[PDB]
Paper text:
The PhoD family of extra-cytoplasmic phosphodiesterases are among the most commonly occurring bacterial phosphatases. The archetype of the family is Bacillus subtilis PhoD. This enzyme is a phosphodiesterase but also has significant phosphomonoesterase activity. The physiological role of PhoD is proposed to be the release of phosphate from cell wall teichoic acids under conditions of phosphate starvation.
The structure of PhoD was determined to a resolution of 2 Å via a multi-wavelength anomalous diffraction experiment using the iron cofactor as the source of the anomalous signal. Three active site metal ions are coordinated by residues on loops on one face of the β-sandwich and are covered by a long C-terminal helix. With the knowledge that PhoD contains Fe3+ and Ca2+ ions (above) anomalous Fourier maps at three wavelengths allowed the assignment of the three active site metal ions as one Fe3+ ion and two Ca2+ ions, which we label CaA and CaB. At the Fe3+ site the sole difference in amino acid ligand sets between PhoD and the PAPs is a cysteine-for-aspartate substitution in PhoD (Cys-180). Specifically, the CaA site has irregular 8-fold coordination with all amino acid ligation being provide by Asp residues. The CaB ion has regular octahedral ligation with Asp and Asn ligands. The C-terminal region of the B. subtilis PhoD protein forms an α-helix (residues 560–577), which lies over the active site. The C-terminal helix blocks access to the catalytic site.
Numbering used by the authors: 1 to 522
Amino acid sequence: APNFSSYPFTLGVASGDPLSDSVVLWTRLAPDPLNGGGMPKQAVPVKWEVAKDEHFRKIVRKGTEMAKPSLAHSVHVEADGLEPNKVYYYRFKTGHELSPVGKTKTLPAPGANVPQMTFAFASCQQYEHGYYTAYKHMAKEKLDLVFHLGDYIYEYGPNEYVSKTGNVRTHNSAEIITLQDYRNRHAQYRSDANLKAAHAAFPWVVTWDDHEVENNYANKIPEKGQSVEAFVLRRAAAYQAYYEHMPLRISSLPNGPDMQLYRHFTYGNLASFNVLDTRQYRDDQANNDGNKPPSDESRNPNRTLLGKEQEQWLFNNLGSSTAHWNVLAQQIFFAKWNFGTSASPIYSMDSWDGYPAQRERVINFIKSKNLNNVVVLTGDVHASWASNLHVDFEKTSSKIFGAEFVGTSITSGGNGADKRADTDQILKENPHIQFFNDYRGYVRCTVTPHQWKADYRVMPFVTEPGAAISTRASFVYQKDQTGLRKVSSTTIQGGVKQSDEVEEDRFFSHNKAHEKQMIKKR
Ligand SMILES: [Ca+2]
Ligand SMILES: [Ca+2]
Ligand SMILES: [Fe+3]
Ligand code: NA
Ligand code: NA
Ligand code: NA
């Protein structure tokens, strides 16, 4: 009989990591969410129900979990005994308090011959840079699931990482360090009504990038020559807070600074999804990070992004898959992405171009199995791109093994534009690249056995609430040497047409943030 002085489900509900017979259900009791949750230091019973209908007359599964202080009174339920490829509704009750109703959906039975799948993927939602209008629109989509590919939170204090179009909202605290700091930052982001609606609408498959801990971290090495010892404690705090706020299974429970997040599942026989973790195990960025010429350092063949175990696990999944599609749901730019010239190349040291030997091992394995059904989903870069993936990244004449869809950010970077100052140059230098756009939004994918379609769903602005969404462009890939085909293209009403931004602005703006952090320590 817990009683509350304020409505406890301030962060809503969520579901995730669906399998054919179960799904994770999530909530958190947080009546005062930005001040640590406002809960007493005792375990609180939370009842849960799963039904076939939204009025809960046809309940199929129910139980009681004990929400505990040591996990910020979060609740993770693995609701099993469910049927495959079926929509369910779920809700929680604590004392007399009722959560919002959530909607979810189990996967098809393994090997089921499913004709179609629709999903969206998102990344990069800097709270200060704009409103979450993208998620208002996403919540109205008809999707089987959603992927989040990282930067679900950012770690900064206020007035540090400042958008070109202004910081319209403000982080709740100084730069986040402790478990409580991370919990409160997750609560700030998750309090947004639009994000909560998108969570209540679909099951999510999440994976993190850098800003869930700190900018451009690499395994246990923080950026800018900061302390490794302090960073390891910080990673443990960040990983715990992430678990507490995400609909993950119990095998993802962290143990100190370590946490199993990479994982695999198949959507019938249509698509095999490898959800990667390119932060937790990676070697340090070469050449002091940033955008630099390649070097013996960056080209060192021992350097890894995935780590040895994840690499082998991935090869095992790719080699044994009989699905129509093999998908890498991951964080960072995979295709060749030269910012310089052929003679004097310049590459992102934090992207796959910074880890070329690791990329070679993945491509060589894909070549060895003769695959041409590989799709890579990406975030991080705060703009939309699409590329044909060739078995030799230097030869457009080489065989196309797949495609990469790089999604823009939900908000990071501000209102943006259709085109930037360096767009024509980069496209010229990188002819495998078929698309650039710099408006905020997300990517919607529709998959059938012989065709993959990606729609880029974008808005003219995020600095004010209420922008309309449109499909800027749509591409289809059909597993042949013609690669990506543009099937739609529309100009965005009310959007800036061309800015003077260049890719280096993202690195520069993150470095200005760090400088401001240092100045604040006087
Ligand atoms: Ca970064
Ligand atoms: Ca990132
Ligand atoms: Fe980001
Ligand atoms: Na580094
Ligand atoms: Na080495
Ligand atoms: Na920092």
